[PDB]
Symmetry: C2
Subunit: 193 residues, 2 copies
């Protein structure tokens, strides 16, 4: 296709800096988070996007980022919500490690939350959504760390387990496109701050 | 580990702009290529690298890029040479398509040149090389499009066939590291021009 799928992770929060897993919890962006968002929109500005359709996660930290980035949101949907961490909500990876030493959200999932299968499907639906609009315009997802990686991993048609192989820091941008007929990851870890 | 593996593709040449596959052929950087290289070194400057060991491909376009980027090369080795295209040297993907409609270097390889297996092994040796120095410092490979992708694909422990899923434009930087014990791709398609 002649278009792209861009993904933007929301800025920093008090929880992200501590490595805490935040799903449905409504945490606010820090002042550093607001600045990150502001710089990202600055960066999106020179990406020369074609009449972009912006889809955003319902969380306030992502809605806030979109506004601060100077974007106008077209669709707000839980489809882009972060991985539901269930019982692990608020826990860091080490803390989770004290009980499940080999844990990775990518292979284990979360007890009382979303399983890999469920996110795999949610990720595919998201990619399907993107492809429909990319027929005429560029697409931008303002979402979260793990889910954004989920989308990317699926864009490149790999098992969701591979989400562990791609970073996605706060206020960072990843870009998906094509090369000689193949869906490909073009940019990752792009930061304007 | 506490260190990173960075990869830098050489700047633009008269052949790259045309989408021609260049392996052993000694093509020069265009003036645009020299500028790209110059900007990349500018970009490497703010990456705060730890006493970096720089390994470079023997081709003149890569040696030139390193010099223009303001880098001092520690090791020059064919280990980082581009995929040997054999019979396809000089051909574009469409041209190759006129004979092998479903061709991708990643799955087919090149007749009279390197096979996937051979590049898979060369890529792994390169990763092995990096890990040995990353024990005390950061590593920088100045190489080519397909091979750099090969190294990245292997860094993340995927079959070489997946090299098709990662872009690597001229004068672009990719960065490999770790996240909670897992080898991961941190940055891709980073451009200073």
């Amino acid at each position: 296709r002649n278009h792209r799928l861009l993904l933007l992770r929301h800025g920093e929060t008090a929880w992200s800096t501590l490595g805490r897993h935040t799903g449905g919890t409504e945490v606010e962006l820090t002042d550093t988070g607001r600045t990150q968002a502001e710089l990202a929109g600055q960066l999106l500005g020179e990406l020369e996007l074609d009449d972009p359709i912006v889809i955003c996660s319902p969380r306030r930290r992502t809605l806030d980022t979109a506004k601060l980035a100077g974007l106008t949101v077209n669709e707000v949907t839980g489809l882009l919500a972060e991985w539901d961490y269930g019982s692990y909500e608020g826990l860091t990876t080490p803390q989770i490690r004290e009980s499940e030493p080999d844990w990775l959200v990518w292979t284990h999932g979360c007890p009382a939350g979303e399983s890999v299968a469920q996110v795999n499907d949610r990720a595919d639906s998201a990619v399907a959504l993107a492809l429909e609009h990319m027929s005429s315009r560029d697409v931008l997802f303002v979402s979260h760390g793990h889910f954004s990686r989920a989308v990317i991993t699926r864009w490149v048609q790999l098992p969701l387990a591979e989400g562990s192989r791609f970073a996605m820091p706060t206020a960072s941008i990843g870009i998906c496109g094509f090369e000689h007929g193949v869906r490909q990851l073009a940019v990752l870890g792009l930061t304007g701050h």
